[PDB]
Amino acid sequence: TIHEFKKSAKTTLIKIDPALKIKTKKVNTADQCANRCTRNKGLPFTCKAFVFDKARKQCLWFPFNSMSSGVKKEFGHEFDLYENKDYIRNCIIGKGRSYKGTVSITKSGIKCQPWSSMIPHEHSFLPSSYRGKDLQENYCRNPRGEEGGPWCFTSNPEVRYEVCDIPQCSEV
Amino acid sequence: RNTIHEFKKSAKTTLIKIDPALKIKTKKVNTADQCANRCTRNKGLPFTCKAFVFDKARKQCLWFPFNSMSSGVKKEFGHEFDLYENKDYIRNCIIGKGRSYKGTVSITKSGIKCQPWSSMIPHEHSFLPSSYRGKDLQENYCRNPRGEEGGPWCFTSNPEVRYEVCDIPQCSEV
């Protein structure tokens, strides 16, 4: 169940708007939060994300995610944020500068090289140089808003970088 | 690692490419799960896998760099086929009133599981699929078949709540 969530380590979400509902429960593992969220059983809202507090072993289920207005992500070493992929926009606007989905394959079908790997391809596209642009895992990204949309360094030594094949929101 | 439950399934359906230029990959297999895993992993495919079909009679996976909504491709009926579309390539946000919404959200704004369109339980209704062709009134997905101002909705599995809008974000509203 936990794999149709995008995981952001060491992160929680704080609501500013107090009208947005939350539900919390002391639980055993993050897996149990995800199961509850996906099947949405005893939650008075549509679960869009949850946070697992590893130290208190508590689930926090939310009808919002990090891209919702009224909320802020925050560092916290004991938290992991899990966002339901159905609520992370899976199509691109403009050149895809704001794309935060989890596609990690190029247009010709090659798996992306993680941004924090220098192999096979060395580059200066590391997390800290483009803070706010989610150069996490090996996700297709467009940090500088370049022509062909989100792209990545390729796990193929033969191919430095290639664009991915994330549809324009205007495609269909 | 059975990834099959993560696709949107359309029974009795395969895809045929009008455009001859588009590229498939096929393989003889035992079960539909094996097609799913290879699509999810995108292992050994010279393209991005947006959908696959399992042929239950010929025991074959067909992997596509397109889905049922791509130009140059059309559905075809067949008892032996099931189509599985990768959710990462089915637009998960709404444009306008969401008349063309094809995503798989099936819970209302207040968290109620939607009633299947094909069922009259708890709620009797005339939003039958056959009455709304092209509006994809399948399973219990939130839909807006008449294009009304509130966005996609569904009849509800709560006997006290006949229908409710679902909470699906607009693709772009600045």
Query: Domain of B116: which CATH number?
Result: 2.40.20.10
Final residue in a domain of this structure, among A54, A88, A122: A88
Q: What gap in Å lies between CA A38 and CA A18, rounded to an integer? A: 24
Option in A40, A102, A106 nearest B107 (CB) = A40
| Statement to judge: residues B75 and B112 lie in one domain | no
Q: Which of B56, B52, B119 is nearest to B87 (CA)?
A: B52
| Statement to judge: residues A94 and A113 lie in one domain | yes
Total length of chain B: 174
Q: CB neighbours of A136 closer than 8 A, spacing ≥ 6? A: A8, A115, A127
CB contacts of B113 in chain A (<8 Å) are 40
| Statement to judge: residues A77 and A93 lie in one domain | no
Q: Which of A46, A61, A84, A111 to mutate to test binding with chain B, by most B CBs within 10 Å of its CB?
A: A46
| Statement to judge: residues B12 and B86 lie in one domain | yes
Structural domain including B149 reads 91-174
Domain count, chain A: 2
| Statement to judge: residues B115 and B63 lie in one domain | no
Q: CB neighbours of B29 closer than 8 A, spacing ≥ 6? A: B35, B54, B59, B60, B61
Q: What gap in Å lies between CA B108 and CA B167, rounded to an integer? A: 7
Q: What gap in Å lies between CA A12 and CA B18, rounded to an integer? A: 48
Q: What gap in Å lies between CA B25 and CA B43, rounded to an integer? A: 12
| Statement to judge: residues A70 and A3 lie in one domain | yes
Q: Do A90 and B95 touch (CB under 8 A)?
A: no
Q: What gap in Å lies between CA B34 and CA B27, rounded to an integer? A: 10
| Statement to judge: residues B35 and B75 lie in one domain | yes
Q: Do B90 and A90 touch (CB under 8 A)?
A: yes
Q: Do A89 and B89 touch (CB under 8 A)?
A: no
Residues preceding gaps in chain A (C to N > 2.5 Å) = none
| Statement to judge: residues A108 and A67 lie in one domain | no
| Statement to judge: residues B59 and B47 lie in one domain | yes
Q: Which of A101, A132, A108 is nearest to A4 (CA)?
A: A101
| Statement to judge: residues B80 and B105 lie in one domain | no
Q: What gap in Å lies between CA B89 and CA B8, rounded to an integer? A: 11
Residue A30 sits at the vertex; the CA angle it makes with A29 and A36, to the nearest 5 degrees, is: 100
| Statement to judge: residues B21 and B105 lie in one domain | no
CB contacts of A109 in chain B (<8 Å) are 42, 45-49, 65
- A149 backbone φψ class: left, alpha, beta (φ>0; ψ -120 to 50): left
Final residue in a domain of this structure, among A37, A63, A88: A88
Final residue in a domain of this structure, among A59, A88, A117: A88
Q: Which of B73, B71, B68 is nearest to B11 (CA)?
A: B68
**Which value in Å is the resolution of this experimental model?**
2.0
Structure tokens belonging to residue B40: 């999810």
Q: What gap in Å lies between CA A52 and CA A42, rounded to an integer? A: 17
| Statement to judge: residues B98 and B80 lie in one domain | no
Which amino acid is located at B117 in the chain?
A: W
Q: What gap in Å lies between CA A16 and CA A62, rounded to an integer? A: 13
Q: How many CA atoms lie within 13 A of A63 on its CB side?
A: 21
| A21: closest chain B residue by CA | B110
- A14 - beta bridge partners? A72
Element containing residue B81 per DSSP (H, E): strand B73-86
The answer to whether the beta carbons of residues B94 and B168 sit under 8 Å apart is yes
Q: Do B92 and A93 touch (CB under 8 A)?
A: no
Option in B46, B88, B105 nearest A101 (CB) = B88
The answer to whether the beta carbons of residues B36 and B52 sit under 8 Å apart is yes
Q: What is the CATH number of the domain that holds A1?
A: 3.50.4.10
Q: What gap in Å lies between CA B110 and CA A132, rounded to an integer? A: 32
Q: What gap in Å lies between CA B128 and CA B140, rounded to an integer? A: 12
Query: Residue A81 to residues A18, A29, A66, B132: CA-CA distances in angstroms?
Result: 20, 13, 9, 39
CB contacts of A86 in chain B (<8 Å) are 87, 92, 103-105
